Design a protein around this motif. Structure first.
Motif, PDB file in Angstrom:
ATOM      1  N   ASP A 100       1.790 -10.136   1.238  1.00  0.00           N
ATOM      2  CA  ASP A 100       2.841 -11.140   0.936  1.00  0.00           C
ATOM      3  C   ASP A 100       3.444 -10.727  -0.617  1.00  0.00           C
ATOM      4  OD1 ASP A 100       4.263 -13.585   1.073  1.00  0.00           O
ATOM      5  OD2 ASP A 100       2.608 -14.716   0.396  1.00  0.00           O
ATOM      6  N   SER A 101       3.467  -9.639  -1.018  1.00  0.00           N
ATOM      7  CA  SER A 101       4.321  -9.296  -2.149  1.00  0.00           C
ATOM      8  C   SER A 101       5.612  -8.562  -1.942  1.00  0.00           C
ATOM      9  CB  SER A 101       3.203  -8.507  -3.183  1.00  0.00           C
ATOM     10  OG  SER A 101       3.139  -7.438  -2.507  1.00  0.00           O
ATOM     11  N   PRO A 102       6.350  -8.688  -3.087  1.00  0.00           N
ATOM     12  CA  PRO A 102       7.649  -7.940  -2.790  1.00  0.00           C
ATOM     13  C   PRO A 102       7.484  -6.521  -3.204  1.00  0.00           C
ATOM     14  CG  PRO A 102       7.629  -9.403  -4.818  1.00  0.00           C
ATOM     15  CD  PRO A 102       6.240  -9.648  -3.879  1.00  0.00           C
ATOM     16  N   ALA A 103       6.553  -6.246  -3.988  1.00  0.00           N
ATOM     17  CA  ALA A 103       6.373  -4.873  -4.198  1.00  0.00           C
ATOM     18  C   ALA A 103       5.784  -4.010  -2.813  1.00  0.00           C
ATOM     19  CB  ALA A 103       4.980  -4.846  -5.259  1.00  0.00           C
ATOM     20  N   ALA A 104       5.102  -5.020  -2.188  1.00  0.00           N
ATOM     21  CA  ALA A 104       4.669  -4.189  -0.848  1.00  0.00           C
ATOM     22  C   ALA A 104       5.648  -4.176   0.178  1.00  0.00           C
ATOM     23  CB  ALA A 104       3.285  -4.978  -0.421  1.00  0.00           C
ATOM     24  N   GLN A 105       6.494  -5.414   0.014  1.00  0.00           N
ATOM     25  CA  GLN A 105       7.585  -5.429   0.862  1.00  0.00           C
ATOM     26  C   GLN A 105       8.347  -3.897   0.690  1.00  0.00           C
ATOM     27  OE1 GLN A 105       7.745  -6.608   3.436  1.00  0.00           O
ATOM     28  NE2 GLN A 105       7.147  -8.457   2.661  1.00  0.00           N
ATOM     29  N   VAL A 106       8.707  -3.741  -0.502  1.00  0.00           N
ATOM     30  CA  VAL A 106       9.370  -2.379  -1.042  1.00  0.00           C
ATOM     31  C   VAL A 106       8.531  -1.435  -0.691  1.00  0.00           C
ATOM     32  CG1 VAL A 106      10.515  -1.138  -2.940  1.00  0.00           C
ATOM     33  CG2 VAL A 106      10.757  -3.548  -2.766  1.00  0.00           C
ATOM     34  N   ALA A 107       7.328  -1.195  -0.658  1.00  0.00           N
ATOM     35  CA  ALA A 107       6.507  -0.366  -0.320  1.00  0.00           C
ATOM     36  C   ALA A 107       6.921   0.415   0.974  1.00  0.00           C
ATOM     37  CB  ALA A 107       4.991  -0.666  -0.436  1.00  0.00           C
TER      38      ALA A 107
ATOM     39  N   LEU B 141      11.318  10.179  -7.840  1.00  0.00           N
ATOM     40  CA  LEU B 141      10.096  10.441  -7.588  1.00  0.00           C
ATOM     41  C   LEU B 141       9.483  11.068  -8.695  1.00  0.00           C
ATOM     42  CD1 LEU B 141       7.906   9.908  -5.602  1.00  0.00           C
ATOM     43  CD2 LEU B 141       8.460  12.148  -4.485  1.00  0.00           C
ATOM     44  N   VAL B 142       8.204  10.448  -9.202  1.00  0.00           N
ATOM     45  CA  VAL B 142       7.365  11.103 -10.101  1.00  0.00           C
ATOM     46  C   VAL B 142       6.116  11.555  -9.365  1.00  0.00           C
ATOM     47  CG1 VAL B 142       6.252  10.718 -12.365  1.00  0.00           C
ATOM     48  CG2 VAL B 142       8.503   9.609 -11.799  1.00  0.00           C
ATOM     49  N   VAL B 143       5.575  12.833  -9.796  1.00  0.00           N
ATOM     50  CA  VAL B 143       4.188  13.256  -9.331  1.00  0.00           C
ATOM     51  C   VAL B 143       3.323  13.675 -10.307  1.00  0.00           C
ATOM     52  CG1 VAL B 143       3.109  14.756  -7.588  1.00  0.00           C
ATOM     53  CG2 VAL B 143       5.610  13.835  -7.234  1.00  0.00           C
TER      54      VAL B 143
ATOM     55  N   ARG C 182      -8.433   5.521  -7.505  1.00  0.00           N
ATOM     56  CA  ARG C 182      -9.874   5.702  -8.024  1.00  0.00           C
ATOM     57  C   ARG C 182     -10.704   6.472  -6.607  1.00  0.00           C
ATOM     58  NH1 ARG C 182      -8.427   1.850 -11.642  1.00  0.00           N
ATOM     59  NH2 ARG C 182      -8.683   2.738 -13.774  1.00  0.00           N
ATOM     60  N   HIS C 183     -10.311   6.105  -5.385  1.00  0.00           N
ATOM     61  CA  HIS C 183     -11.307   6.644  -4.512  1.00  0.00           C
ATOM     62  C   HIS C 183     -10.509   7.022  -2.965  1.00  0.00           C
ATOM     63  CE1 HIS C 183     -13.678   3.630  -6.915  1.00  0.00           C
ATOM     64  NE2 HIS C 183     -14.583   4.739  -6.818  1.00  0.00           N
ATOM     65  N   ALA C 184      -9.148   6.931  -2.824  1.00  0.00           N
ATOM     66  CA  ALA C 184      -8.536   7.339  -1.799  1.00  0.00           C
ATOM     67  C   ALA C 184      -8.692   8.810  -1.487  1.00  0.00           C
ATOM     68  CB  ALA C 184      -7.184   7.135  -1.691  1.00  0.00           C
ATOM     69  N   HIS C 185      -8.785   9.226  -0.278  1.00  0.00           N
ATOM     70  CA  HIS C 185      -8.754  10.539   0.022  1.00  0.00           C
ATOM     71  C   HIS C 185      -7.589  11.264   0.308  1.00  0.00           C
ATOM     72  CE1 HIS C 185     -13.238   9.028   0.546  1.00  0.00           C
ATOM     73  NE2 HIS C 185     -13.418  10.074  -0.014  1.00  0.00           N
ATOM     74  N   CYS C 186      -6.260  10.936  -0.311  1.00  0.00           N
ATOM     75  CA  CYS C 186      -4.947  11.452  -0.005  1.00  0.00           C
ATOM     76  C   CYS C 186      -4.234  11.147  -1.003  1.00  0.00           C
ATOM     77  CB  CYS C 186      -4.531  11.064   1.369  1.00  0.00           C
ATOM     78  SG  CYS C 186      -3.830   9.654   1.283  1.00  0.00           S
ATOM     79  N   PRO C 187      -3.084  11.679  -1.516  1.00  0.00           N
ATOM     80  CA  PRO C 187      -2.200  11.271  -2.522  1.00  0.00           C
ATOM     81  C   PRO C 187      -1.736   9.870  -2.125  1.00  0.00           C
ATOM     82  CG  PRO C 187      -1.342  13.133  -0.986  1.00  0.00           C
ATOM     83  CD  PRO C 187      -2.874  13.052  -0.986  1.00  0.00           C
ATOM     84  N   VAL C 188      -2.160   9.101  -3.459  1.00  0.00           N
ATOM     85  CA  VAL C 188      -1.582   7.693  -3.507  1.00  0.00           C
ATOM     86  C   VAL C 188      -0.497   7.687  -4.036  1.00  0.00           C
ATOM     87  CG1 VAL C 188      -2.136   5.644  -4.377  1.00  0.00           C
ATOM     88  CG2 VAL C 188      -4.083   7.065  -3.659  1.00  0.00           C
ATOM     89  N   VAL C 189       0.431   6.857  -3.423  1.00  0.00           N
ATOM     90  CA  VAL C 189       1.653   6.430  -3.734  1.00  0.00           C
ATOM     91  C   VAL C 189       1.891   5.020  -4.359  1.00  0.00           C
ATOM     92  CG1 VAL C 189       4.119   6.399  -3.383  1.00  0.00           C
ATOM     93  CG2 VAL C 189       2.783   8.146  -2.265  1.00  0.00           C
TER      94      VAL C 189
ATOM     95  N   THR D 188       9.800   4.244 -10.839  1.00  0.00           N
ATOM     96  CA  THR D 188      10.059   4.991  -9.914  1.00  0.00           C
ATOM     97  C   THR D 188       8.882   5.206  -8.970  1.00  0.00           C
ATOM     98  OG1 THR D 188      11.535   6.138 -11.011  1.00  0.00           O
ATOM     99  CG2 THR D 188      10.929   7.304  -9.246  1.00  0.00           C
ATOM    100  N   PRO D 189       8.943   5.261  -7.736  1.00  0.00           N
ATOM    101  CA  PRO D 189       7.679   5.703  -7.042  1.00  0.00           C
ATOM    102  C   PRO D 189       6.697   6.841  -7.817  1.00  0.00           C
ATOM    103  CG  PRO D 189       9.478   6.294  -5.636  1.00  0.00           C
ATOM    104  CD  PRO D 189       9.840   5.282  -6.719  1.00  0.00           C
TER     105      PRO D 189
END
Ligand SMILES: *O=[P@@]([O])(O[C][C]1O[C](N2[C]=NC3=C2N=[C]N=C3[N])[C]([O])[C]1[O])OP([O])(=O)OP([O])([O])=O
Ligand SMILES: *O=[P@@]([O])(O[C][C]1O[C](N2[C]=NC3=C2N=[C]N=C3[N])[C]([O])[C]1[O])OP([O])(=O)OP([O])([O])=O
Ligand SMILES: Nc1ncnc2c1ncn2[C@@H]1O[C@H](COP(=O)(O)OP(=O)(O)OP(=O)(O)O)[C@@H](O)[C@H]1O
Ligand SMILES: Nc1ncnc2c1ncn2[C@@H]1O[C@H](COP(=O)(O)OP(=O)(O)OP(=O)(O)O)[C@@H](O)[C@H]1O
Lengths: 261, 261
Positions: free
Chosen positions: A9-16, A225-227, A115-122, A254-255
């Motif tokens: 329910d967050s606007p950050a996630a909306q935009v995600a 985009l920053v990486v 800290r635990h995901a098995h793929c690049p986290v954005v 920026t993402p």
């Protein structure tokens, strides 16, 4: 599969979503949407995905992801996502979810995934791609992703390597101008192996003396985009995320993809 | 031994001493000071400890710690400290060190200790003791420390237990007023085992419906020490610090001890 994207329910996630939508369009991959939890519960989750999809329709232009998945799952967000990441290209998540407030700038979910995901986290908040390099293997990921990205996004790139990981330097008269040009050479060197691979993407390279975060961050204001990797040269024993990763993730405008696994 | 206290060129750490000084006075324990690192180096470290001690002189009133240790150690701050914590009563560390900047609110050192130190970590920034309880075993530490503390500091205490760890509650018509009074009973219950142990310390107890951080935090404005465990009821697999601990530590306006090990 495809690019998963935790929603709440967050606007950050909306935009995600918007940014997951277009990244799963620019590549022909499924746009899966996942809302975990612990009924108003089920009924609430339904609305989230209804709206989340409503964003996807608006977001994309020409194609509309080869598949648009979504799934409400009765389980602890983190465990669920972390597990689902295993078979995903990318993990998109808003910085701050519903239950955020002023001073905060990460959350149980975004925190745990970095800290635990098995793929690049954005992590996304609310034209070139800036990249934080130190040749520290975990960034030779990140630089990979950064190019791959700036190809499909038919644009430029910007590499950035800070000389010192420790702040000040205010050490004795070390010849900065000279150690600088030789860090600029060395950087130019290890982007040559890519520059070929990817013509049509202008490699701009910047060497700085000092703080590698306050600069990646900052200069994110001018890129799209920053990486940066999940780890680097240095770091201690049971660490799960670089102090420079996390900080750039929670403060950039920026993402911020954060390569891992 | 005693209460260790990492020091560097930051005002947060300056202040970390005053609060380590007086806590190693109120108990008859050594006030060890440690400055790790990776020469201007050695010479810089010297000045830090000279000034750090200069703070201790000012800080204490009547006694001056039974021993005042300090040691510059050529090693990665974290590994050093984490190891030294093993034989320490408490770990005092400033929130933000030299090399901080606006949006930031923790650092490689403070961050890592809250996730790996072998003793309650205290992060200080720049009369009663508020305590965040959920009976989740890691807080039955914290409540222990909170009393112990408010004895030697001849004062009051304030317990605080939020009913729900998940935010909203905006769930169906659950009888809050009634589930509240019964959480107030239950809390009162498990502070009875202490109340005895420690007369002369007024146990004030507060039960809230919702967010347990934005309240511990906040209501820290009115107390002189906040205490909360490194973990709790809930939390996932390889977690190292509670999302509620960390957040209260980085946002409260009062020293925050975070019980561990
Ligand atoms: O130092 P880290 O937090 O960095 C991990 C990622 O950060 C980026 N990065 C690291 N160092 C630099 C950098 N970008 C530019 N310039 C420099 N000098 C990089 O993309 C990494 O992927 O990870 P550590 O070092 O393991 O953890 P710390 O430094 O906090 O101990
Ligand atoms: O939930 P946590 O971050 O909490 C760990 C510490 O936080 C305090 N605390 C936890 N829950 C409450 C609380 N104080 C008051 N009221 C409530 N309801 C407590 O002192 C704990 O020591 O740790 P978790 O749950 O393992 O991690 P999360 O919640 O982030 O998944
Ligand atoms: N239950 C969930 N299922 C799927 N995705 C989620 C869930 N909760 C949060 N997310 C996503 O992950 C990101 C992190 O949200 P998070 O909940 O960690 O922030 P917060 O709510 O402010 O902090 P906390 O939840 O720890 O109080 C958000 O952008 C959100 O889109
Ligand atoms: N080398 C060190 N030796 C001993 N104590 C330290 C050292 N560095 C920092 N500390 C202490 O630990 C706390 C955390 O400082 P830290 O250096 O993590 O913050 P920062 O410098 O803003 O972040 P970073 O160092 O990751 O850039 C500070 O309050 C400081 O007193």
């Amino acid at each position: 599969l495809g690019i998963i994207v935790g929603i709440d329910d967050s606007p950050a996630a909306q935009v995600a979503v918007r940014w997951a939508a277009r990244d799963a369009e620019l590549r022909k991959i499924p746009l899966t949407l996942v809302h975990a939890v612990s009924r108003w519960q089920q009924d609430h989750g339904r609305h989230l995905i209804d709206d989340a999809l409503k964003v996807v329709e608006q977001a994309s232009l020409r194609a509309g992801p080869p598949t648009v998945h979504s799934e409400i799952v009765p389980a602890a967000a983190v465990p669920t996502l972390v597990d689902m990441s295993k078979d995903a290209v990318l993990m998109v998540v808003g910085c701050l979810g519903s239950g955020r407030w002023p001073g905060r700038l990460l959350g149980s979910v975004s925190s745990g995934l970095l800290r635990h995901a098995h793929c690049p986290v954005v992590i996304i908040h609310d034209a070139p791609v800036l990249v934080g390099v130190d040749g520290s293997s975990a960034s030779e990921l990140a630089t990979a992703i950064a190019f791959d990205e700036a190809s499909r996004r038919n644009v430029d790139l910007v590499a950035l390597h800070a000389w010192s990981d420790v702040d000040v330097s205010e050490w004795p008269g070390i010849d900065w101008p000279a150690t600088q040009s030789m860090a600029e050479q060395v950087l130019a060197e290890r982007l040559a192996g890519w520059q070929e691979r990817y013509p049509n993407v202008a490699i701009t390279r910047v060497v700085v003396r000092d703080q590698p975060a306050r600069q990646l961050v900052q200069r994110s204001e001018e890129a799209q985009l920053v990486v940066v990797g999940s780890r680097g040269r240095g770091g201690y024993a049971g660490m799960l995320v670089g102090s420079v990763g996390e900080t750039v993730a929670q403060l950039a405008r920026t993402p911020v993809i954060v390569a891992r696994e």
